[PDB]
Amino acid sequence: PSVFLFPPKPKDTLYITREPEVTCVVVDVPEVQFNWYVDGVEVHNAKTKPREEQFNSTYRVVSVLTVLHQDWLNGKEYKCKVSNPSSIEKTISKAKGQPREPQVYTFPPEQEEMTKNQVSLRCLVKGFYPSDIAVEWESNGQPENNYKTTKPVLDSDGSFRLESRLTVDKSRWQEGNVFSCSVMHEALHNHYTQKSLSLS
Amino acid sequence: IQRTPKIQVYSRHPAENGKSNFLNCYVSGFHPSDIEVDLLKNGERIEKVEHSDLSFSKDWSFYLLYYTEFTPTEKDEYACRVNHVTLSQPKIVKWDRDM
Amino acid sequence: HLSLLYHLTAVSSPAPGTPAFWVSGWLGPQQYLSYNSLRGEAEPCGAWVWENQVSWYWEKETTDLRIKEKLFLEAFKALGGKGPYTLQGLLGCELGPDNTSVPTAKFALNGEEFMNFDLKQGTWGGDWPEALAISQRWQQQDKAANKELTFLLFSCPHRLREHLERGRGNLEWKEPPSMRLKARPSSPGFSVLTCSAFSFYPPELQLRFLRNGLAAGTGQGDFGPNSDGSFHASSSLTVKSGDEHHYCCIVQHAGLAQPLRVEL
Ligand SMILES: *[C@@H]1O[C@H](CO[C@@H]2O[C@@H](C)[C@@H](O)[C@@H](O)[C@@H]2O)[C@@H](O[C@@H]2O[C@H](CO)[C@@H](O[C@@H]3O[C@H](CO[C@H]4O[C@H](CO)[C@@H](O)[C@H](O)[C@@H]4O[C@@H]4O[C@H](CO)[C@@H](O[C@@H]5O[C@H](CO)[C@H](O)[C@H](O)[C@H]5O)[C@H](O)[C@H]4NC(C)=O)[C@@H](O)[C@H](O[C@H]4O[C@H](CO)[C@@H](O)[C@H](O)[C@@H]4O[C@@H]4O[C@H](CO)[C@@H](O)[C@H](O)[C@H]4NC(C)=O)[C@@H]3O)[C@H](O)[C@H]2NC(C)=O)[C@H](O)[C@H]1NC(C)=O
Helix, strand or coil: CEEEECCCCCHHHHHHCCCCCEEEEEECCCEEEEEEEECEEEEEEEEEEEEEEECCCEEEEEEECCCHHHHHHHHCEEEEEECCCEEEEECCCCCCCECCCEEEECCCCCCCCCCCCCEEEEEEEEEEEECCCCCEEEEECCCCEEEEECCCCCCCCCEEEEEEEEEEEHHHHHHHHHCCEEECCCHHHHHHHHECCCCC | CEEEEECCCCCCCCCCCCCCEEEEEEEEEEECCCCCCEEEEEECCCCCCCCCCCCCCCCCCCCEEEEECCCCCCCCEEEEEECCCCCCCCCCCCCCCCC | CEEEEEEEEEEECCCCCCCCCEEEEEEEEEEEEECCCCCCCCCHHHHHHHCCCCCHHHHHHHHHHHHHHHHHHHHHHHHHHCCCCCCEEEEEEEEEHHHHHEEEEEEEECCEEEEEEEEHHHHHEECCCCHHHHHHHHHHHHCCCHHHHHHHHHHHHHHHHHHHCCCCCHHCCCCCCCCEEEEEEECCCCEEEEEEEEEEEECCCCEEEECCCCCCCCEEEEEEEECCCCCCEEEEEECCCCCCCHEEEEEEEEEEEECCEEEC
């Protein structure tokens, strides 16, 4: 059997009314018992689901620890010890280092791509640290789903960067609708900023 | 976050048989604030039970005192039963006189 | 350095026949004040019931806590979002050496600190999106920030000074503990030594163990209130069964002139 320790979704770390959780998954298993530690000290508030059978006739066991928002932000370490030869430990945490504010740039479609059923709105996010970030889009203040975002990638200056592309219908753009790139990062004022874009 | 209640059971004055006293069940360190507390005599609930105001500590976790006027005896056993969202089953703590 | 702190709590979904908003008021470690949304009236608690107090004091506590009731319940509207919500507030003041008042104004959402009121600026703020939403709703409501400013910089310091003059007794009260020291068999070869302090005030108390007059450690301590604003504590130490009579328990307390040695 083998373990995989998963960090909280960044957006959950940044909205105090969302539930950030570390997910510790045990694969290729007959019963598993978990221990959890926060900067060495053990805690007892984890929640284990029942094992479940896979196509390949092995059991998968999942234990989740809810974490204090400010604890995750202060770089504390979450250790999930799996007991079943020995115990296997895994540890996870937020990267240490001077937090840095994301820079956000929006790019309208270049007339050339315009002659199409759909057009692509581009959002560049860079100069940020750590890599924990969430990106969303809105039209006239209401969420959009039809977008794609690259993984944070480290840049030559030791900061991270990332691109997001919102595909929309040509008409919706040419009717002059306000579109927004929304970025959630610990280093932003109230963990949120918005860059807005509309046909000039 | 969610926080599981700590449960202490103690008398207000030292436990003397025959002498009138108060039995306390202090429930603390819990979140959220919705919590059910019963004081038991011989594993059966006491109806004439009062409580302090639901309050909270510097860490924002809530606490609450349940108390009843009683007169302990050699034979009689008291306990505190607690239910909270963080508990899959009710939690029962017996009064041990030592503490 | 004595403090007056209100502990305020609102919930978006109160359980049947419990209040959506309630407040307990504290002068140091004693509750002097109770208010809830169902009764709608601030009331003295225990000994403060017969404080040498002015005729309108309780009407003015009521007025202020009703404005806070409305404010806390507006905050939920600014979140919209999902799940049920708990907004808690820790608002008060403490006296500083040269007739100065040091204020406190923190808030927590679902059990976690997220927002404070800046008394220099007269504004709500915190590091969190929910602090932006609630601050903006509050800051825009006519005179909210001014009554918050007034509650903390005028009302809390005056209330504190009046309670020091009119209720000096209540705060200087010294009830030293009644002590017990019992030994119970735990594991074969071993006993648990429990030192217990009953019905004491104030709450600061130190329990430690000696073995033949040498420090044998503090043990593992618990602490709790009684119904009457007095306190209880115990400390347990595990010991060699057949060794119990070599141990005693020492208690330091503001009520006791010299430390008190409790023998088995
Ligand atoms: C027998 O069957 C099972 C089942 O397979 C299942 O059967 C059916 C359904 C098939 O479809 C089949 O494909 C299924 O697998 C097999 O079980 C699998 O075992 C393998 C190992 O052999 C596991 O592979 C690892 O995957 C990691 C990533 O896993 C995620 O992504 C996939 C999708 O891409 C999902 O399927 C997984 O479930 C994981 O998904 C994540 O789940 C998290 C927890 O639920 C989510 O987080 C939580 O989300 C919730 C709500 O959504 C909350 O928000 C919580 O807050 C939050 O915590 C998360 O959203 C979700 N993410 C995504 C993207 O979906 C890999 O990371 C890992 O590879 C690393 O480690 C390897 C060595 O250990 C190494 O070789 C790799 O190179 C890689 O190394 C890493 O590389 C990065 C690169 O930057 C580094 O940064 C790292 O440091 C480095 N790490 C290390 C350790 O070196 C594995 O490849 C697989 O997870 C597991 N599947 C399941 C479902 O459990 C079993 O093996 C089968 N046997 C066979 C076929 O022989």
